[PDB]
């Protein structure tokens, strides 16, 4: 659906396949969710899956303790001081009960994303939302669906969520398993809510280095169905081979990545969004359609709340975007929306300037044009 | 490629997802089914028709002629229980392949030396020459071997990771292979099997030029003439030279875990979409030979992943799905083919034809000819007047198969006086076939065969049907669309 | 809205300016010629054929029945020595009429100032200060504030008061008037017959039994107007077409209701802009055309483009750029008044028409053309789709010919409406059908006999196609039958033939 | 187009139109004579919507030029145009007009039978570095001018065409095209063009012009025009009421363009690669209908800017803010396009230009507007008016 078109996939040359293509693996606009666990124990494990594309750290809080998930929460931190340039998400899985591990353990030590289990309609999202609070108004909810019900009510549960959460083996007649996957990976791209795709993709990747033929495929299909984040569960938590996990992963997303049509998909998302859109949305528009004309390196979004940034992401451009914010809870939510890439600033060319010459040192080159937007709305094209 | 747009996949109804319905073999998708044992009955055969079999396939690795003759005489008492169906017929080869030697790391042309796990023999003799110091693959590519060093009769590589058995398959990434693709036995099976009783396709094995194909066709001659040739891609060179393979081939034949041998494992899926993508702008039929259902031999239903897995190939733009394993020596045939139908029923419900045919149109080669200007135009207005049925009358199969390529979201219904034609076009999704008397008219056949699809529930009265007739692939004839209301 | 694109125009070859040799009757606009003294003789005529004339028109508002008919006998003469030549025939109906008196001196010097009365005792001589109005409903027609125009608009009159038998008005503008002239009232429905006993006359004993084509009603108001004039023509006249000419505000607001009773449309700029602002005449004309243009009803102007070729052997520039953007504008039909009918030049009138008409026809974007029709036009009959498929396969194959077999004409209607790049050639038996088809641009006829089947009529029509240098050996031609035409449930066939 | 035109409303036909005369798209060029004299029918003919000045003994014409903005200072900035005579490329008595009145004084000089680009050249010499603000628009009056048209516009500011010049070498039928290619051509390539053509002669003796006349002026406008001129009827009986019906017919025929057509039409026909401001220029013309702006403010100093954003031609009315008198009078040969003249020493400039915009009933409050402006580093600002 947002993958390749059928000039896209004829055009796949001979380099793409019998050539290893030699790129950063965070470069990749797919982002990766692992599950932290006794594999990951270690700090040198830690830093060598963000070296392999982690963007998104999951703390499945269905099995163990808080004393013991501090340990990993303090772990990561110290991971994260590693390496300064790159920054991580953190997310938490739910299983009432969770009720005490929502209100005390994400709160104080301050996640950004709430996987809720179970959810069935619009009324539950509310719910949450009420629970957390003016101390909990920055955490984002995302709803998790393995009930019909939710199906049924997911046009009004995605309305008030900040974003959804679906696994393949939580859905389940059989024939109909994809379709969920499909349509509701869709609406959310036309929304503009961020998209985890859960089920686990590479379960051969937990005793084997290499994963089988079959699994790297539905992994592919996933990207082009035009997923935000895919997620490893047993391949990170206690498999032999958690870190060349992650580097497949990274690895197979930049493939399928290189196949999409992004003219195609831009046009997909302008004809299908409600007819009525705002002026911030236009000049987001705008940066997108500038960009492809001009083919330009870099969007660099100068948002506060994680809103511009959240606009360009929806349009899907073919260049990297560049969120800037004074906001460290904005820099670390962003992360479940795919090719976003977010740096924190302090307080036009105050924070431009420096994004250039920080891009330039991740290599973005050289005589590039450069597309800046700050929303009351602002949009700017400099050289490199 | 072909398959969902954004508004496509945002469509899908819970309708899709909780209800069920439609009949198995209306579906667009063709299924192509390997024989064995556990469909080897007459009656076990007829449900397989009724489930969604479309081809059937002979492997020829295994077992012999007075095998496979009685298998065939099996299919054609089940195409007398079944009328309507009309069945194609493939037989695939065994071809060229690479060996180990014997045992009681250096690679020693002598296949005489029964060596330990220091000296290892290789059946091919000109492998010294053939690769230089590349990687080598043993026990379907289990085992990695790095050649360093090369010599007169000698090849010494390093191992890069078990235990392996005796006689055990070599793969060679990145070299052609300098075997003959017709060994003494394929030609017996193509001169004594596939011409005598009448097969419909080969799936030539380890296809890696287009001379290949032509030493192929020139093997089948007169006799062979209406018999399809489909390459097999399974190495680096069929890539390479996939191009010119595809323009002299009558179709393609590809497995995932074949490709998925000489190419790094992240990129298997590159190499899939390729080729159908191309196939499909030629309007070249693609099989998609990966076994996508292999618990369906032991399980009554398939995973979650395998689901998505077939369903992902068709909307990659495949013609034909196969199943291999499981309707060969498995325990739950009937049940492979049940649910492959299925799925495919649904995925096919997700195609934006429209927007199919759109991209068709813009990336297809910049001037066409008369005939398929025609083709657009019935493809055009059916989809204008929401047709249920273009009818193509076709000696050849050559009309059916511009209307195909251009990929019409209602059924084709071919006919034909040819046998052959009837049973060739199968390849082909969306198409089914009636087999009529020697053309009388275009008014005379037109009218008897809305008649048959009525009598088939294929169209309804009040539906709208365009009818095509071309004098075929010759230059300057006079080409007919004709619209007609079925009431 | 139906000529040059950006891209057309920026591609006009120097060629197209410096070189000058196609036949005249290859063209796709069609010409109406008025037939008068200038062009009697059978001569004449057959040289107006040559040159391009496709529509004769008599204009009934003068001559005799016997003149008319012996006009009417000398086109038929001409007819005969030109049997590749098939032509309509229009009659002009007089309709009503609204005029001055008679003056005192037989003309009156009206001044900006001046107050003048009108009154509708039409037996009143006339002076400077009071002048009758053979409208006797005026005074309870027109309210304060309401414009009366004299003399073709030459004088405007502003009305003051109004009271039983007379007018009040205050001259907007000073001039010199004459006796009997015609005068017009702005926003007021005319409440006179629109057809007398005289056009009446004409009607039932002119244009039936000497079988024209066309009536060109003069002053319609509405579609009750139209209704009228069928119930008047009966089961006798149900093959003539009935042809409105829209010459007043009440037309223009109606035109809609009009246009769907009507047959087609005839638009005179000097009269439909008459109590229009002179500012916003071309917008009526652009509105109607297209309307037109999207309902497949076809178009007649009829405004007199080249006046000054009753004298001269040759154009202003403007009268030559004037044509041209009415062809370009989509006018199916263009039409010559004095230049053929009592000028000294009538041959030459014709000519330079086809000329200008082949020359702008060069500059039309056909691509352009036919999407904008079709996203404009919701939901459409298979016919029409049919239809569609030809001109669409025609722009693919770059067809020499669209052949369109059709016993009322409503098939070769369809596919004009979606104006090809290539001649449209209708077959048909009837001798309505070929003669009325020719107010349509781009469709030419050949009278055919009785076909049992597709085949035969098709191939001869390709040989009379070759001889007449339509098509050549090689050409692709597309032929579409109908068996029920405007009938739904029917066979619909679109047939390429490449000639041999 | 067909959906623009039979869209034509009744309002359109029977209603007069009250929209002020000066905020037409369509720019009017006027010959200066006799007629136009007096400093009181001169400011009277600016109201009618006087663009540009057509200057057609020596003194006299320095009468004119100084009553000329007397006229412009008691109101609006104005245009100066210098038609040479012409017939041996460049006449002694052109020489002695561009260089002694033309350089001395105006922004635009009519250069008479250009027949190569290099007469253009010819005549950018003789104007120097002090002719380096004019701007040169070759007359084609000629073949040769229109079969090297391509190098004579690329080197040229802008062209002229009149239809009585190109049409004495031409044959009768073909007179039409020759204007339709080169306003098509100009419009492709940016350049303003004059169309000189005398349409409206009949206004030399009568207060209302033909309806033939009405719609060859009508015609010119959705052509693709930039500009019009009255030439006899401005320098006539009634050269006042000649100007506000030349208004009103652009007005009137501006009504009926498909804005949404021209700018696909041009984007498609266009050289292919195009820089980086240019981009930026369709964006701020593409972003202007899509959020239904009320205006686009370009911010520029050589004019440009503006150039660029006039080239795509958007529905809305296009504000031209510069420093500089040059390029303010320069850029009035462009359709669609207003000047303000603002000082020497941008968020004040944009904040300036809104206030007068209320004024001139060009925009609204809680309309949005959107503004340009490019150093070389480009911008493109939505605000929305308070």
């Given at each position: 659906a947002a993958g390749a078109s059928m000039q896209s996939a004829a055009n796949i040359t001979l380099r793409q396949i019998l050539e290893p293509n030699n790129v950063n693996?965070?470069?990749?606009k797919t982002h990766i969710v692992c599950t932290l666990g006794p594999a990951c124990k270690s700090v040198e494990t830690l830093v060598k899956l963000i070296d392999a594309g982690m963007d998104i750290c999951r703390f499945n809080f269905?099995?163990?303790?808080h004393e013991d998930h501090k340990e990993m929460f303090n772990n990561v931190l110290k991971a994260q001081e590693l390496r300064p340039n790159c920054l991580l998400g953190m997310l938490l899985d739910t299983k009432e009960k969770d009720k005490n591990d929502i209100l005390n353990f994400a709160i104080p030590m301050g996640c950004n994303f709430i996987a809720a289990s179970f959810i069935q309609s619009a009324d539950d999202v509310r719910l949450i939302r009420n629970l957390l609070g003016p101390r909990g108004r920055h955490i984002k909810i995302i709803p998790k669906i393995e009930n019909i019900e939710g199906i049924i009510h997911f046009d009004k549960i995605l309305a008030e969520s900040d974003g959804i959460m679906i696994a393949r083996g939580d859905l389940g007649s059989p024939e109909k398993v994809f379709l969920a996957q499909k349509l509701m990976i869709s609406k959310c791209n036309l929304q503009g809510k961020p998209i985890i795709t859960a089920t686990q993709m590479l379960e051969s990747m937990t005793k084997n280095p290499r994963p089988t033929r079959a699994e790297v495929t539905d992994v592919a299909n996933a990207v082009l169905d035009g997923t935000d984040c895919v997620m490893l569960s047993g391949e990170?938590?206690?498999?032999?081979?958690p870190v060349e996990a992650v580097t497949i992963m990274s690895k197979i997303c930049l493939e399928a990545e290189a196949c999409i049509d992004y003219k195609l998909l831009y046009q997909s998302l302008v004809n299908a969004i409600e007819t009525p859109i705002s002026v911030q949305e236009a000049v987001a528009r705008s940066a997108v359609e500038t960009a492809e004309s001009i083919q330009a390196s870099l969007i660099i979004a100068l948002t506060e709340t994680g809103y511009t940034a959240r606009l360009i992401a929806k349009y899907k451009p073919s260049c990297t975007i560049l969120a800037l914010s004074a906001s460290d809870s904005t820099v670390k939510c962003l992360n479940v929306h795919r090719g976003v890439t977010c740096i924190k600033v302090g307080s036009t060319d105050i924070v431009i300037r420096n994004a250039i010459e920080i891009a330039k040192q991740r290599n973005a080159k050289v005589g590039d044009s450069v597309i800046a937007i700050h929303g009351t709305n602002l949009m700017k094209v400099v050289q490199i």
């Open positions: 693996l965070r470069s990749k269905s099995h163990g303790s990170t938590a206690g498999g032999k081979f």
